[PDB]
Structure formats: structure tokens, C-alpha cells
């Protein structure tokens, strides 16, 4: 009976994957624009009084945990202000290196925030004034915000996985920054497969992967994992 509507279930799961990727792409896109705008505006006049005033504005401080500018001399400005660890250097941080490596904006993987000590991600971009970089701007979003975004939509759940197979954001915090192989050792889903049927705790799940279109610099996927019996029962 299943083998007759199995192509049907594929169609629903692909649809659910697409919708989820679309939403995330949309939620991130406005935040990417604010950081880009901040960087465009800094490049206007990169005097440090100006920078501070821009990063203090409510549109940025209500949207990000903090935003900041770092330069090639090692200096930085962060708003809201925070006590940084001794010897903190913005140049070595994943937002800075990421932004300098790309011709456009970028998004980090999860990393440990120097300010709060919590796992976050960052949107970052180089502020270019007339072709020349003047530093890197970024904004921090917490993993909990990202987890909350994903879990909005009883078959299953969504998670965010990079195109290298590293889980970035998953409702089970234990699996954050684990590869697929490490998180699903017994029976590993493969991105190369439209659908991967895997056993988790003696139950079959169906896992697909949907690319998130329209992100700058990164190729990430939405993963969907659904209980096979619940999915078919539907």
C-alpha cells in the first residue's frame, strides 16, 4: 500500500523543505540587508564617532545581540558596549576572516561569542569605500533565536546543515556542530540522496535536504526528518 503513494510522500516532503528554506531565506534576508546598510553607511564616513552613532541605533540594537566594526589595525567598536576578554583581537575572529574571504556579505557557522560566551552566528561584510576595504561589520544572532526560527512550523522537524554535512542548528542542541556521520552514526543520511530512510532508535525516519536559495557566500541546506509511520499516516 505504501509503495503506491510513496512518490506522493516525496512530493509533500519536498514541498515542506522548500517552504521552510524559503521562510529562513526571508527571515535572514532583512537582517543581511541591515548589516550591509550599516557597512555602506560606515564607508560613507569611517570616522569613529560616526561609527559609534550608527551602531547605537535601535534598528540594529533591537535586531542583533550586538553589532560592531573591526579594522586591520586590530581596533573595534561594539554596540551595545561589552567587556571583551583580555587580548581580544577582531582580526582573528570567524566573522572577520569570513568577510575578508568573500566578495560579498557572509554568514558564519556557529561559534563562541567573545562577548557573551554563548554560541551564536554572525552576519558580516567588509565595508568598502571606493573599492578599498575599511574594515568588517557584523551582527550577532543567538543559536536560540535560530533554533526558535526553525521550530515555528507532528511528523517531524527541521534543522540547518551546511553543504559539507555539518549540522549548524538543530532542536537537539547536542547535535549542533556535529557532522551527519557523527550525529547519525548508526545509519547516516546522505545529502547526495533526494531521500534517506534511516533508523533512529528502532524507528524509521525519512530525511531530505533542501538548499536555501539567496544567501550570500554560504551554501546551506534545510534538513527535514520525519517519522515514516506518521508521514505515511497523512
Ligand X SMILES: CC[C@H](C)[C@H](N)C(=O)O
Segment near ligand X (CB under 6 A); pick from 34-42, 110-118, 141-149, 202-210: 110-118
The C-alpha cell that represents 131 in the structure block: 573599492
Question: Is residue 64 near ligand X by the rule CB under 6 A?
Answer: no
Question: Is residue 114 near ligand X by the rule CB under 6 A?
Answer: yes
- When computed from its CA atoms, the radius of gyration of the chain, rounded to whole angstroms, is 20
Question: Is residue 68 near ligand X by the rule CB under 6 A?
Answer: yes
Q: How far apart are CA 128 and CA 69, in angstroms?
A: 12
List the one residue from 78, 123, 136, 224 that touches ligand X (CB under 6 A): 78
Question: Is residue 189 near ligand X by the rule CB under 6 A?
Answer: no
Question: Is residue 71 near ligand X by the rule CB under 6 A?
Answer: no
Question: Is residue 93 near ligand X by the rule CB under 6 A?
Answer: yes
Burial 195-218 (b: 16+ CB within 10 A, else e): bbebeeeeeebbbbbbbbeebbeb
Segment near ligand X (CB under 6 A); pick from 8-16, 107-115, 147-155, 157-165: 107-115
Question: Is residue 90 near ligand X by the rule CB under 6 A?
Answer: yes
Nearest to 224 by CA among 234, 216, 233, 212: 212
User: How many residues lie near ligand X (CB under 6 A)?
Assistant: 10
Q: How far apart are CA 20 and CA 109, in angstroms?
A: 19
35 half-sphere exposure, CB direction, 13 A CA radius: 30
Give the contact letters, 128-167, x = binds to ligand X (CB under 6 A), - = no.
Answer: ------------x---------------------------
Segment near ligand X (CB under 6 A); pick from 5-13, 15-23, 108-116, 155-163: 108-116
Residue 69's φ and ψ, nearest 5 degrees, are: -130, 135
Question: Is residue 221 near ligand X by the rule CB under 6 A?
Answer: no
Specify the 3-state DSSP secondary structure of 189.
coil
List interacting residues with ligand X (CB under 6 A): 68, 76, 78, 90, 93, 113-115, 122, 140
Amino acid at each position: 500500500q505504501r509503495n503506491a503513494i510513496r512518490e506522493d510522500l516525496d512530493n509533500y516532503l519536498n514541498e515542506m523543505g522548500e517552504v521552510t528554506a524559503d521562510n529562513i531565506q526571508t527571515w535572514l534576508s532583512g537582517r543581511i540587508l541591515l548589516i550591509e546598510n550599516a557597512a555602506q553607511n560606515i564607508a560613507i564616513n569611517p570616522e569613529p564617532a560616526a561609527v559609534a552613532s550608527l551602531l547605537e541605533q535601535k534598528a540594529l540594537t533591537s535586531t542583533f545581540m550586538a553589532s560592531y566594526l573591526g579594522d586591520a589595525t586590530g581596533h573595534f567598536t561594539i554596540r551595545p558596549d561589552a567587556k571583551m576578554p583580555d587580548g581580544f583581537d577582531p582580526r582573528v575572529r570567524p566573522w572577520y576572516k569570513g568577510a575578508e574571504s568573500s566578495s560579498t556579505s557572509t554568514l558564519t557557522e556557529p561559534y563562541i561569542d567573545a562577548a557573551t560566551g554563548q554560541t551564536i552566528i554572525s552576519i558580516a561584510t567588509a565595508a568598502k569605500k571606493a573599492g578599498q576595504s575599511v574594515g568588517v561589520v557584523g551582527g550577532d544572532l543567538s543559536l536560540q533565536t535560530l533554533i526558535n526560527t526553525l521550530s515555528a512550523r507532528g511528523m517531524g522537524y527541521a534543522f540547518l546543515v551546511s553543504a559539507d554535512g555539518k549540522i549548524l542548528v538543530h532542536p537537539d542542541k547536542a547535535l549542533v556542530m556535529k557532522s551527519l556521520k557523527e550525529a547519525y552514526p548508526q545509519d547516516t543520511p546522505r545529502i547526495s540522496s533526494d531521500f534517506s530512510e534511516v533508523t533512529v532508535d528502532g524507528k524509521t525516519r525519512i530525511v531530505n535536504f533542501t538548499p536555501i536559495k539567496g544567501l550570500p557566500s554560504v551554501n546551506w541546506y534545510i534538513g527535514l526528518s520525519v517519522d515514516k509511520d506518521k508521514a505515511f499516516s497523512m
